[PDB]
Amino acid sequence: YMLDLQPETGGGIQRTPQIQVYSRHPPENGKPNILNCYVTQFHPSDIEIQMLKNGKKIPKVEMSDLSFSKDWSFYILAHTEFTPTETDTYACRVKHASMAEPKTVYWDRDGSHSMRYFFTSVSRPGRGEPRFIAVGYVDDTQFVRFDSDAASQRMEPRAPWIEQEGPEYWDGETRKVKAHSQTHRVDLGTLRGAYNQSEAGSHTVQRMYGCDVGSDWRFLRGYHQYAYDGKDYIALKEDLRSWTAADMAAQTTKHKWEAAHVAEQLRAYLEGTCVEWLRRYLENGKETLQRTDSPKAHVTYHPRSQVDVTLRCWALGFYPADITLTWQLNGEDLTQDMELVETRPAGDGTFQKWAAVVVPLGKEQNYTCHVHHEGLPEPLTLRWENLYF
Can you list the domains of the chain with their CATH numbers?
Answer: 13-110 (2.60.40.10), 111-291 (3.30.500.10), 292-389 (2.60.40.10)
CA-atom Rg of the chain in angstroms? 23
The set of residues, in sequence order, having a beta carbon less than 8 Å from that of 106 and lying 6+ positions away, is: 21, 89, 90, 91
Measured CA to CA in angstroms, residue 16 lies from 31, 46, 97, 265, 301 at distances of 34, 12, 8, 38, 31
| 240: alpha, beta or left? (left if phi > 0; alpha if psi -120 to 50) | left
Technique used: X-ray
List the beta bridge partners of residue 33.
82
Q: Residue 34's closest CA among 68, 66, 77?
A: 77
Position 218, amino acid: R
Sheet holding 156-157, edge to edge: 156-157, 141-147, 131-138, 113-122, 204-213, 219-228, 231-236, 243-245
C-alpha angle with apex 364: 361 to 369, nearest 5 degrees? 145
Q: Residue 341's closest CA among 316, 363, 359, 307?
A: 316
Position 261, amino acid: H
